[model samples]
Target: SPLEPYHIYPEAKSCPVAKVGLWNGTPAHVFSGYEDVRTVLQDRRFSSDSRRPNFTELTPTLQSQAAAPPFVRTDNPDHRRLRGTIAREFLPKHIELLRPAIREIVQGVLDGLAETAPPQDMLEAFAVPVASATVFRLLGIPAEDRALLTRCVKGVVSAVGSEDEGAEVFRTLGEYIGGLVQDPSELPEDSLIRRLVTGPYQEKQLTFHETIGVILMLIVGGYDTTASTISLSLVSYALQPEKFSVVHEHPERIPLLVEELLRYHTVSQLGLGRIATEDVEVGGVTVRAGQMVVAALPLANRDESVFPNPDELDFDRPSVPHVGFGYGPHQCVGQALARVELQEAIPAVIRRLPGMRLACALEDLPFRHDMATYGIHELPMTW
Candidate 1:
């Protein structure tokens, strides 16, 4: 069953439009059983604005100081406006320019890992810091504040469902961004913070609150997902030793391996929930207006019809349509940076520790099951 707790939960396996009733009695129609979920993701009928009918139940802390209308909550004209404004900054070519800096960061982190002996918890030592430092550099956060920023991202990542924790993270994030916003003179500088504050986008820019939210989104998106991907990639390699050997020898395979790993793990387990604008038939079933819809990217990636032998990891697969990032307008904006981080970090660590394997039996591994992500809490490994 696609809705299984051990795996992922969609409303149903084959229903084009299935009722997904929460324990709280809030019901949503999920469009996960077919490829049409991809269409629904891009269709104007599905609204990402987050202020529509029945939305109050979703984002209950709307008035919090941390709340801001970043790209996630936006619909067409606004989505297009903001994404278009920032698109050039995140393109593969633009991100490629930062590879040297990213590599330096990865090398530095790996150097620290070398100083410490295994069994290393890759999540704490390698993945988290690499992703965090990469984002810190990308966002132009100060090196002096790196530890504080890392704490904020760490707290923010694990604090998914708790309103209190979420609010505290936002408060901390707000204070961090507030520091940047307080100094307008700091704008026009090389930092992402500067770009958001004083760059060309400032005219149609996000408010101070909105500014904080965007930075928060960047930190979380940049930190947790990549961290999870890195950890999962290593786990995948450890699980399939033969495949791991192939990648370990031919490091060039990492880019393709990263794509496959993204499909295989699907770290961020849930897609952002969207509300229907009006009644519409999709995947041969009708979805009513105001009904929430969740497009299960993880499920869709595993659909055998779309991906033959869906469960197998094939680095050479001719075409892979993994939405480890969400689809359409809301597809992860930082995906390019993520690709760079994973491409460099995974192989680097593997090269350094060719004998790395799980320190604990697989069944004893801790997973964050309820937190809208399916990532191991700790990846204990030894060389």
Candidate 2:
């Protein structure tokens, strides 16, 4: 059962790692301890390339897309080169400059929420829009075209869906991106897409397919994950209102609160996948070459040894490291931007809707355990 994975953290954390049975007929290893997950992610012996013959794919959609691995799923040299093409745009300093604009977007969403009646679905009215807008703005996609792109992204991330539908969505998205690359002059001068086509592709540093792949990577990676983080954070606060009060009273604690929330929720249920390149010992068990390894990030984040009272959300728990954004060479490139968005958005929600509470029973909300990212389908809230 897909939901069963979410409940295995306590059991996984009790050992060095947990063997969660075969995933798609491939032996799957789930590393729950922080150090073990980090070690596998950082070690070169574990490969991220999904093209490996034995690499496991949990869904038909994923298996279908495995042949043309995204940059995130490829090893270095190829990964390094692809990442190098646009790494500067996501640098902390560059992303920092977008904070003011991000804040404006956050405020705009809250203002909309203010006008709407209680029991609004934050996932639709707030988180999804803000996430879509930010990613669209960052990529220089026209505002009018965002809805089309959002639909395609949603299709790509759907867990239990038709593989052909997902493939068609990717095809259409690729065509759209190809059109952009064909006319770079139409894009905003400073936009990431414009910079890529004009700079890297123009210089032959990136091939057309690679350029399109990168755009797809940014769109898929940025949208759902950030949206999930925001939605999950809100759900967490609604579940434990005292946590929200702590942030509302001391805004200075927002950063810490955001980190704790990220750790506690760990949006990516089964972090990225890797194929063992050699016989590697992880969490005291030998994972033979060609076997598949998955980092159960939620479990790793809640490892009691690394995070005291692992299940509780404690903002003052002394800033222990977490794999919330992943680890090593494949650590999320857009994480800096994600952090800024969350830091601004979460606190603003608390400040504006100080009395915000769940409008329905927690059990009544639909959680997306079936998707690549875990979050509520609709977060109904009232103040």
Candidate 3:
């Protein structure tokens, strides 16, 4: 059952806070209720860095990303400074300019899907390409390199439980990224890697390795979650073809549908993690300093008090904010880009393939429960 792994959430949310062990059996506090989770995230006392002694890894998969932790896993002034450098490109206004480019990419991928055949795995054929291409385009890189990019990420996630195999792939991926900025002077004036190389690295604001970490953060972070959202949102609508048809005709409601799908799935399966730096009261518990707390995004997203009948997916649901992109200082920086991708991709898919329907039974589909991101392995669809 897709919900089997999540059974512990309701019970955990019942209490003000619950104690659970992390990947290494490190005792950590779980803040599940909406208000409590927000308190943990918004307050800096719960540091995002998971490397502190006695602190658990943010999520199991993060351990493999330890070679060079990105800004997302860091604390300010480091987080603030690093994030500020690239913040210009991701701002709403900057991201808005990518809409036409993103729409072109989305339409291009759909055209490819139209050629291939019936019963294509949309997760692979559509979702993965669109997400990968968008990030690559933003980075000013060529799409031909996406194959190698996918291999490394796919290899790492595939070997989550086996450290050795992951290490091999990670090294290759890093080497590839490292070479991109090896000669910053040679890169185009408008490129992201060029900006990093010439600005931060040149000025010694960030080391060579740290610069790669930022790129790694954007490449991996943006690709996986955004891709998963695209796939899962497709499934959500596929499950209710009637509602999908409504949006297919109207099209304007696609943005609202995208927001609801993001909330409904809340894909980061293990939630965001932080370690308490000082004693603080949240929910009904006084969490002591030095303890680790996971602000459960899924539970917070579905909190009954915050969103009535939280389980139901409602396109017209009032826009009470959700932690789907997280909250506080560490909230997702690429959110605007992701918003554009979904806003363009989802509507285009349904519109282009008007007869698209699930090719397999619901139970036959494999759902990702073990990975940090939750998505279907393959979504077979026929027109």
Candidate 4:
């Protein structure tokens, strides 16, 4: 029940696209079927700008802060420019070059796991550290500052609490990043942030706010999503040990297996809300202009029509385009890097911890349904 769509899927199957009342006093159209979700996301008529007057937020706190959303929440010109500035860094070739380093980092974590006591929380010992190391290295942040940066990002991504608490964590992150922007010489010589502040800012290609926005986006987006995928991949393996043998016997299939795992988990359970700029037909239903639409990614990914035997997890399934990282102009910029991390990390786990299995029953595990991204809070495992 934690991550599975027990009830939601049944409803979505009957009506792939339907409207529901929002807490913000607006009606939102939800798209679940694969075809419907793909069409809505790719259509230019739908706008990603969260600041649109009619756009709805799930909570009051989020609604108030929607005015200054990250680049992922904005439309082209702004989104295009911001994303383009850092696109080259995450390209497949660039990410591939980092694979050796990523594998090393993962190996270090797994090595540490072997020395630890039985029944370790893999989320803490393994997944988080690997993700934090990879993201910090890619961002050009100093190795010594990774722990602080990790804490700051975790606080920001956690569920909203007292207004003051959220503001303080946000301000703390901004201040730290702002300091780096002002004094690039203090940062590492080869850091991405340093290059942006000194090179692009000097050339007027990007502004100070844009630079800070990208940094925050990279920090927040890079960590938890990949961590969730890694942790959940292990959970899936534990639930079905037979699948683990498939990868162990045929290591060359890891990349294909990783893609399938991404599709099966579809970590971002709720896709970002988009506004309809013009009346458009989505899955035979007409969504009027100014209406808000939410993509139920979990349902879309499991659509029986698109992925036959949808509920079953098959590593050998033919590769099909899945919106796990999203689609269209606003697709995740760090996706290539995420793929590299998963492709290398998952196989390494199975090969290294050959006898690893769940220390407790699957139903007893703690799942973070409240957080924006779906992931286990702690994964207890033993060899």
Candidate 5:
């Protein structure tokens, strides 16, 4: 189960809206009830601009990343237009084009793992590569740079350590993408970067900074959460090996199971943070203007009223909109592609290797508690 107690943010689970002290010892409201979480997310009064001047961050280290918030972090005009510009790339039709490409990538991972020796860390060997290759390939990034891109992402996801040291990797990643944008020819004509560079970027509709921001948002959102879901769900498959055969025998249910897995994992462990621009009421509590509120998605998914026996994963569970991809205007730009990736990647691994099982004891596994996203960091597996 991906359910994590609200240990650090005290009272998040107990109260619909809890006044919790942030890491900086400042208080913020944490909305954990499913209804309250949605209210905060869809409401325009709650500002998403953590990077904006005068906004307070839950963690002091968050200030650095908040310096230039991505598309979702800003309000309309920016959030609206930025999302629209990139949504074209993630349109289900375009995502359909990536399906076979993603399937090939999945097979490549399965084949590579088959050839490797026992106890291969599937996180590195299978999940990361599948996620990395799928996303970078979509960006029209050259194969040669995949390693560098992955290394930078790995650096930035340093959930357990060293923000001071990790800033260098983020800067490097930015510089690398900046170079690509500076020279649009670096990417294929069909690549998302080329379209972005030539379209709004050249039209002056989007500034140079915004252009890079769009790409970074897509990559950061697509790559990290996609990989996190794949990695965490693999642990699920290893736990319930019998479920694999069900998917194999009924391939039509891949999407069904993927949805359930997404809910169960709800990878964005801490959920999202926002600040109220105007005084508002949430779950009957008054959120003063300029105060911060964090939506606890992990708890929302487990809201028993919305999801009966929420912790249990049921493939045929009656489908209701889950905030696994999130809700509101800033949901997820790459959600369509994410669905396609998960639909292909998970079943392929389990169906391809019937003997797959955990090489190490489950209790000994290194869960990614240190990272913002919840997952098993390195799953040792053997077939």
Candidate 6:
């Protein structure tokens, strides 16, 4: 039987070998299907290039970015080249420099929470705006159009449920990016977009469609995931005010707690999809070429073998190495930025809300099931 809906299944080993099929009914890949999915993640034969025919289930924007005709969508040299081209901008130092601005945003949101009024949804008030603004600022989006950018990000991410909606978002974003590229004078100085549009790699630079594709990926990946993380972390605190108090007393613990929460409730339940490039053996299974595989990251993070007492929520657990942000080359590039935002925001929320509690019963919380993310749609709260 499948494990309980909310808990990770102990039998889903990350390192064992198994066979698995593509989401679109492709032939089964044998190497890491049932077991050893982790091993398969490390296999060079596995490619993030989702251009295979079996990828019909993905949104057009996702398909475009992942299957983008250039190097970003290819294996090895291409992936390395494209990723390397953007690596310098995403380094930890560059991300860390944004701390002052990010901290301002975090504090600004907490300050906006009306003490005498009804409790508010933090997702709308803080997470969405901060995450959206930061990502767009990095991408050189204009301040005046921030709201539109937010809507576009939300529409595309929410559109994961339907292909038509996703395609619409793709079209809208493409046109918007094309207009931006045409009038370089409108772009802000020192922003990534301007740099990319006029950098040494300008020839290899993203086309209008590709730029929109990149923005769609970054904005959705930036906004929704962290928004969900912030909301769920607050939900965790709401259920355990004592835990919140502890963190409030020692604000520095937010970093560790963020890591733990990320591990404990990996918002993303599904793994990044990939296709096998060659014959590979994983978890005692032989995955053949041209087959697809899912990494099952959430399951891997909670495996008791790797994380003892995996279900327990201990903020101080030492030597904990979980795959909440993924592993290897495909690990999340924005992890450092995410950590800083979470570290600042989580502690601030706990400190500001003295009597915070869930407005609704745990059983009444609404969860999004169809999307790859597991998060409450509405997190009602009270103080």
As for candidate 2, its clashing pairs are none
Writing each residue's lDDT as its tens digit, candidate 1 over 1-383 gives 21122244534564546676642457776655436768888787888776554652333232132234456787877677666656778999899999988899989998888878789889999888898888877787777877777666656555244556657766777787788866757443677877777764367555566666677778778788888888878887777767866565667777778888888778766545777889988887788888777777777677778788777877867757677787877988899999999888888888887778889888787776645566778999987
- Per-residue accuracy of model 2 over 267-358 as CA lDDT, tens digit each: 88866678899999877889988888788788778777889987777887776777999999989899899989999888888788877788
TM-score of every model versus the real structure: 0.90, 0.94, 0.93, 0.94, 0.93, 0.86
Q: Which wins on TM-score, candidate 1 or candidate 4?
A: 4
- Tell me which of candidates 1 and 3 scores higher on TM-score: 3
Off by over 4 Å in 4: 6-13, 23-25, 58-64, 159-165
Question: In angstroms, how far off is 337's CA in candidate 2?
Answer: 0.4
Candidate closest to the true structure, highest TM-score: 2
Model 2 poorest ten-residue lDDT run = 1-10
Clashes of each: 0, 0, 0, 0, 0, 21
Deviating ranges (above 4 Å) for candidate 3? 1-5, 8-16, 58-61, 64-68, 155-159, 162-166, 185-189
Q: Indicate the residue-level lDDT of 161 in model 5.
A: 41
Instruction: State the C-alpha lDDT per candidate.
Output: 0.72, 0.81, 0.78, 0.80, 0.78, 0.65
Across residues 129-207, which tens digit of lDDT does each residue of candidate 6 receive? 6677777778878888777766776565552535556666666866777676666678888877777666634576445
Model 1 residue 236 lDDT score: 72
Q: Kindly report which residue stretches of model 5 are placed more than 4 angstroms away from their true locations once superposed.
A: 1-10, 51-54, 57-61, 160-167
- By the lDDT metric, which is better: model 3 or model 6? 3
lDDT of 5 by residue, 337-362 (tens): 99999999888887777677889888
- How well does model 5 score by local distance difference test? 0.78
Task: Between candidates 1 and 6, name the one with more favorable lDDT.
Answer: 1
Error of 2 at 69 (Å): 1.9
